[PDB]
Design a protein around this ligand. Structure first.
Ligand code: HEM
Ligand code: HEM
Ligand code: NA
Ligand code: NA
Lengths: 717, 717
């Protein structure tokens, strides 16, 4: 090995390969953003002419370009695949992937094997991006083109929301440990796919079109289809509708040997202008195109919505065969259907063909019941595909407040984790002050109030923008039972008291002002922090933004919320079983999901410890002699060289900090000690631990606290 | 190999090992900075009681701490080593390293083998940093503590400048290609050290204390001493003065085997709280301390300034011997000087010892002349050490306007690239506008004016803050003869015409208003940009800040300015011979030294191309039909899929862009085409090439141009 220049990627990871990487807390940094600090994409796309945008995309779709000629004269099918692949990286386990940031245009997604030829697809839409400019993000354009493709070929969609904000660096995501494209080191037990992954091989969207590891067994492939799509939030009906609906259009490409296809875009030479997979087979495009290596045309109407896919699937018997590149596919038996499938460039007709994974829809008993019903009753397919496609393309959009434009449909959807509209006037400054005082007089402790507010708000994750304190779901299943939230039953007492305050305030309230339980949860935390900072000699007011509303249990999909349960929350010194990495790594990952910077994470940990927010009120990291007091004691004591730290003899993830007399003075976890050990984190601790730092600490803590309380408040942004 | 989680360092560099790394353009991002955007270190520094700070440092130096007991009851010598190592990473080829960012507290420098035990040294200063808080950076404190140590032990220093702002992440710098600490793959020929390095092995500051590659030949060691120090801006007299001056104090540490010393700080367990090199030899500290493995005490007065180092060097004869840890060192022959050297902890006196590299001062003919003189003239040694030590610890401070505090002497120093004080009233709005008109009417072309202004300003590098347009040095040696500046070339003509305008304005100007040549060079580029924007149909004003002054040749050290000459400038499409990496990497490297973001680099390239700023007015990348008009044509045409690019058949670093007819329409270099090929840069090009983007492009181009024009203008901020 050799070390490289930083401009060629050399850096400190080379010398200390396992080191904590704080880069995850400064993704998409503002200096790399070419737009002004005042740029507001929502404001820009709110003024776009959707009708003109559609007509322009329709012109692109029927104007073949010589560097990638249009199959059947229509790019729609290619744009549908492009959009499905943009949304198809989404995973429920961390909410990462999806189309919400336009990450398909960056590495590694722009160069995954399964995204072959989408480099040309995205290039075909530059004339639209060029015309609409800052009013249209690549992120929106990529999925809207797929939506327009459907509509122009005869499928009416449920609707569409704009608002995906373009980014300028790829989000770095763990896609698997495999160091070879298409590799597989991600299964254990009886075909247990490693969490958090949602594809069966490195660089695939979901499954292998030739069957598991290339064995074209449709029954076995259905197992992989069902589980990967489950991990992408799709059930059996949704999964079958998406595959049938997608393969109603277009064709696969495998006209010649795959070893004639050159390097992927990130590996390709400069003259290719960001395109990859240059092919020396024939013309390398169009009639000679190679993408997957498979050569299937599912329907006799590749540019039209109808029920041909299932009529063909069930109307023939299927035989294993090979594409011109040598990949497995299926063809109709006994020369049946000869010549009935049209050629993309006017050649002679061909025979019916299907992927092994299409046959899964007929061979798997559950998919068979679903798809045979749609064979007999096609209007049910149209309905389920419209709902599943809408979900797929919007799954990572966050609260519905973020959806913009004239195509947004009004209906509420359970999967959107809906919260009720505001139905009364909101508390003002006087009512907020009164509620603060009442909660402070209620007998709830600073620790209880801060812990509950943090438990509610910190359920948010910035990947797919799910979770948060809006909805008041801390009192509903499953959040009320989460181990980190309610180890001992204390949470139910906090919930009851706040509900009593909600009832007495609302029944006595002036005019038409009413307050939600969800707001009171957050306000309670803000009140306790004002109390604790007063105990520490600081008169501060904690910001509070009203307007959260209270979801019902019936409006809360308990199975869907399961993925939001923390297995680790270093801010509460909580480490459950099953995490992929040691505690300090899980801490930074949590800070990343909360969109926190390193200074924000550092101040939050120090303040939460001394406020008593620790899981089970454990003393780990509680480096203070004061109770219910917002001081910078955590940082001061962390830097005290009078304390000698050793791993606890119990070998239990904890440490003992002894003073000069050999007496144990403090105890701590890996999450606590990492702030005193890591050279970048320790530098932040020395800011907040200095003699002059206590006012800055209180100010920076409150700002970070307020940020977390507001993470999901897109209703006011 | 296995791919890792991003939080453990995984990312796109793993899949494409040689990819351009755009992170070099967002070092120390604002999100990671815990101080406000409003934080103003200069304003905080101005408040510090420097006499109190000196007393507080003196208390630290004389208060031994149990976890690292003080040799001779004084940490002074340790702090001198600390400060000399902080400044000692500096190198002239790229100006990186040095003490100005406090980078010793971060990886990898905090863990270099040569910085062993400085982890404890810095830790000892936390009580001072704790007391002074935001008024005192770690960067200043590390080097001020060394200065204070000299003064406390009897050496009067020349003075001291505060003003080094703390940074919050490591500057990642190429320190060599060796993947093993103390490795050596950096020599070729007889003894040619690869550029840009200024140390003889990976992790060393300058040279090996046991001689080249461990061969304790003092004559060969002097070859390495002279070359590495030269590459750190020190000549023979300065180098001798620094080595004698430092080893006047303290001792080395090698009491036992180095294999009993544990991992360097970045690799050490959490409980060590950021300290490393934990030793199981005896108490592992103090009397049992192991740092280098050498056990030498140079002088009979390790805590006092006097002339004992040279009196001992010349007063004994020296024989080669081994330290207790097995390292080569020298000791007096014939058992001379028994017991004359004191022990750090009251042990028995010991005999005189020296390093191989100390004998170099007596063995090398040039150093022998210099130091034999100081044997009888310690007053000259003191004078030369004061000047060289001041130089060493301020070398990267930039213009003297940055030096803060009450200890900065006013004497001008040639190495500081001085510029005259402003001696007349400065041009105002009326005079600036009149001069712009005169320059626009002078007959100088937009290409000439923009090229010359860029040439002057872009000599700045943010590493050591040398260079820039202040000084008017573009008309002086050596900048007037740099290949990139004056190939043919119009430079002398531009200089002459600007000088005529300066003469004509100054002999007829209002009041006491005089304009400098340096200001006119910059103002000329600003007026040309205004002219080119008008030719495109935009009335704009380019900001301009007067106040540059004109250095004379006698105030310009020609050999010191040699290192500022660009071997590559992608902003002018100039690629000389001898660069370490292909042209697109040298572009990012240049953008980094100009402190530019990726958007700033992008607009500058597109703008300079169409303004005609290319070296030798070559057509590479000049993707426009207009002559000297400020449009976004570069970006529009880069994204034109009607152009097919191929490397030129001449294999000459260039590409041909052909239209549909097969006619060559454009030519470009790697630096041009990388903006169309790299997926992160192409995204920025798509911002500036959209239909709505030309006013944004002009606005951002102007802001980036103004930034480069002002890079060295610390005199006005
Ligand atoms: C088990 C799930 C799936 C598998 C194994 C699969 C596999 C494939 C393969 C191998 C191709 C050929 C790519 C090429 O060579 O050009 C393809 C194309 C395509 N996919 Fe699927 N896919 C799946 C699900 C979906 C879904 C959910 C959609 C959309 C809702 C979709 C829409 C399309 C379309 C429209 C094409 C045609 C592209 C064109 O005409 O250029 N696919 N798919
Ligand atoms: C050829 C150049 C140099 C070489 C080879 C060299 C080598 C060394 C070595 C091996 C040590 C022992 C580290 C340890 O084991 O504790 C040391 C210590 C020291 N160095 Fe030098 N050094 C050089 C230049 C300098 C300079 C230029 C200065 C300051 C102007 C300096 C100041 C010191 C001091 C004060 C110590 C004593 C540290 C203590 O008492 O803890 N050195 N040097
Ligand atoms: Na069809
Ligand atoms: Na001495």
């Amino acid at each position: 090995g050799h070390m490289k220049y930083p401009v060629e990627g050399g850096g400190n990871q080379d010398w200390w390969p396992n080191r904590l990487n704080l880069k995850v807390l400064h993704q998409n940094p503002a200096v790399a953003d070419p737009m002004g600090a005042a740029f507001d994409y929502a404001a820009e796309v709110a003024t776009i002419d959707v009708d003109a945008l559609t007509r322009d995309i329709e012109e692109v779709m029927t104007t073949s370009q010589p560097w990638w000629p249009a199959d059947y004269g229509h790019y729609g099918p290619l744009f549908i695949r492009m959009a499905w692949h943009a949304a198809g990286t989404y995973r429920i386990h961390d909410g990462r992937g999806g189309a919400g940031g336009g990450m398909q245009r960056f590495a590694p997604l722009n160069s995954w094997p399964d995204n072959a030829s989408l480099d040309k697809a995205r290039r075909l839409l530059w004339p639209v991006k060029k015309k609409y400019g800052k009013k249209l993000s690549w992120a929106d354009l990529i999925v809207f083109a797929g939506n327009c493709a459907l509509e122009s070929m005869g499928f009416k969609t449920f609707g569409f929301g704009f608002g995906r904000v373009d980014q300028w660096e790829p989000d770095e995501v763990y896609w698997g440990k495999e160091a070879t494209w298409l590799g597989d080191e991600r299964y254990s037990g009886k075909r247990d796919l490693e969490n958090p992954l949602a594809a069966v091989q490195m660089g695939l969207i979901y499954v292998n079109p030739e069957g598991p590891n290339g064995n074209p067994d449709p029954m076995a492939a259905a197992v992989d289809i069902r589980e990967t799509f489950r991990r992408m939030a799709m059930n059996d009906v949704e999964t079958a509708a998406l595959i049938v609906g997608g393969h109603t259009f277009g064709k696969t490409h495998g006209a010649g040997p795959a070893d004639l296809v050159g390097p992927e875009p990130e590996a390709a030479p400069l003259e290719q202008m960001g395109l990859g997979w240059k092919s020396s087979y024939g013309t390398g495009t169009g009639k000679d195109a190679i993408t997957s290596g498979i050569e299937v045309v599912w329907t006799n109407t590749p540019t039209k919505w109808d029920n041909s896919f299932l009529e063909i699937l069930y109307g023939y018997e299927w035989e294993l065969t090979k594409s011109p590149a040598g990949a497995w596919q299926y063809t109709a038996k006994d020369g049946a259907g000869a010549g009935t499938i049209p050629d993309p460039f006017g050649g002679p007709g061909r025979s019916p063909t299907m992927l092994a994974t299409d046959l899964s829809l007929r061979v798997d008993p559950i998919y068979e019941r679903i798809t045979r019903r749609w064979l007999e009753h096609p209007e049910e397919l149209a309905d389920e595909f419209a709902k599943a496609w809408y979900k797929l393309i919007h799954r990572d959009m966050g609260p519905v407040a973020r959806y913009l434009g004239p195509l947004v449909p009004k209906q509420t959807l359970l999967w959107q984790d809906p919260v009720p509209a505001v139905s009364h006037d909101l508390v003002g400054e006087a009512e907020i002050a009164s509620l603060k005082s009442q909660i402070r007089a209620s007998g709830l402790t600073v620790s209880q109030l801060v812990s509950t507010a943090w438990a509610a708000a910190s359920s948010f994750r910035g990947s797919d923008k799910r979770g948060g304190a809006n909805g008041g779901r801390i009192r509903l299943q499953p959040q009320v039972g989460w181990e980190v939230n309610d180890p001992d039953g204390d949470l139910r007492k906090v919930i009851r008291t706040l509900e009593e305050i909600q009832e007495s305030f609302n029944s006595a309230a002036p005019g038409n002002i009413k307050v939600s339980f969800a707001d009171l949860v957050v306000l309670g935390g803000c009140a306790a922090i004002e109390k604790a900072a007063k105990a520490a000699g600081h008169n501060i007011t904690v910001p509070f933004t009203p307007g959260r509303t209270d979801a019902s249990q019936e409006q809360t999909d308990v199975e869907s919320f399961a993925v939001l349960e923390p297995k680790a929350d270093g801010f509460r010194n909580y480490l459950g079983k099953g995490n992929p990495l040691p505690a300090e790594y899980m801490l930074l990952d949590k800070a990343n999901l909360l969109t926190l910077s390193a200074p924000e994470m550092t101040v939050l940990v120090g303040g939460l410890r001394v406020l008593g927010a620790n899981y089970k009120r454990l003393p780990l990291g509680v480096f203070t002699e004061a109770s219910e007091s917002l001081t910078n004691d955590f940082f001061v004591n962390l830097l005290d060289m009078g304390i000698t730290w050793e791993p606890s003899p119990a070998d239990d993830g904890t440490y003992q900090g002894k003073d000069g007399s050999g007496k144990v003075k403090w105890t701590g976890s890996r999450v606590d000690l990492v702030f005193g050990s890591n050279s970048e984190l320790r530098a932040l601790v020395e800011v907040y631990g200095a003699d002059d730092a206590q006012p800055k600490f209180v100010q920076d803590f409150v700002a970070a606290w307020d940020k977390v309380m507001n993470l999901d408040r897109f209703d006011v942004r």
